[PDB]
Each structure stands twice: as C-alpha cells, then as structure tokens.
C-alpha cells in the first residue's frame, strides 16, 4: 500500500482537484482535458492528464480509494514500473476510446481503475503466485458499477467508454503478463 507511485498519483489528483476548486472545473479542463481540437493534438500531456481531474469529493475519494487498494497491490507485489506502465497505457487507451464515445469532456482515474480491476483479477486468476487477487466480492461491484454507468445511475453521467476500454486493457495486459514466468 505504501508505494511511491501509488502516493505520487494520489498526491497529483489532490493537487489538481484543489486547483479545480480554486480556478473552477472548466478552467482546469481547458488545459488538462483530452485535445478537443486537432490543433491541440501536440499538447501530449492531455492524453494522460484527463486521469487527474475529478468533479466531486465523491468522484475523487471513490477513485482514490480503489486506486490505493488496487494500485497499492500492484506496486507492492509487482513493482512500481509495472504500475506506471498499466497507468500510462490505460490512461492513453481509455481516454482514446472515451473521446470516441462521447467526446473530449471527461476525466477521472476510473479508466486506470477498471484497468487495475481487470488486471488484478485476471492476474490473480491465471498467475496466483504473483501474490495479488480480487475478491469475487468486488468484481461484482465492478460489474454493477460498469453496468450502472450504462443506465446513467440517478443522473450520474459516467464515462462508459473509459470503463470498458480500461477494463479491456487491464485484461489484455494481465493475460499477456500471465504467460511469461
């Protein structure tokens, strides 16, 4: 749990979030969101910094919770490098698919989070010796959570492309990772 990449990520999300409370959501979005304009396509940070933005205490705490719990496990059991790679690929791919689904105005760490969910479960399943796993007790919620976004649970506009893309990506990485060693 006490991993550097785990905490460096939690710290950044909290910095950025606080910045969002001072400046306002939209003003942070114009700089951190996925490129809305192909002119902006070379502002490379935007492909990753959308993961840093949250729009409610609930949004961020719920995300950081999962991230601490799942990110922690991968960092501890598998190193900081494996975590970063998972975070970068899924922030890049789930941003990418989410932009296709509903455009460039989104953010949150849930893309990376479903990738961690997908990864920890598929990896604990195929490579038990890797010392990580996900309670079926969680994978349930996982699936409630994803399908509840499909129905926009009580007006909650969820990034549905991000969740599934992230989920898929984690499963691919864990499956590939569960062939070596």
């Amino acid at each position: 749990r006490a991993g550097p990449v785990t905490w460096v990520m939690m710290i950044a999300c909290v910095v950025v979030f606080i910045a969002m409370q001072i400046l306002g959501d939209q003003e942070v979005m114009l700089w951190l969101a996925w490129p809305f304009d192909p002119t902006l396509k070379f502002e490379f940070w935007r492909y990753f910094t959308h993961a840093l933005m949250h729009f409610s205490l609930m949004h961020i705490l719920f995300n950081l919770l999962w991230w601490w719990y799942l990110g922690g496990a991968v960092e501890k059991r598998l190193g900081s490098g494996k975590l970063i790679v998972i975070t970068l690929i899924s922030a890049l791919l789930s941003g990418y698919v989410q932009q296709k689904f509903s455009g460039p105005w989104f953010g949150g760490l849930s893309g990376v989070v479903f990738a961690l969910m997908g990864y920890v479960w598929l990896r604990g399943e195929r490579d038990p010796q890797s010392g990580i796993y996900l309670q079926r007790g969680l994978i349930i919620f996982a699936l409630i959570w994803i399908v509840a976004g499909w129905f926009d649970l009580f007006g909650m506009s969820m990034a549905n492309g991000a969740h599934i893309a992230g989920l898929a990506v984690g499963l691919a990485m864990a499956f590939v990772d569960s062939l070596n060693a």
């Binding site: 959501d25 979005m29 959308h50 949004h59 509903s102 105005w105 506009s157 990034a159």
Partner: peptide, 5 residues
C-alpha cells in the same frame, strides 16, 4: 455535462 471516468 461532463462525464466522470
């Protein structure tokens, strides 16, 4: 609106 990942 915005969508929450």
């Amino acid at each position: 609106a915005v969508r929450m990942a």
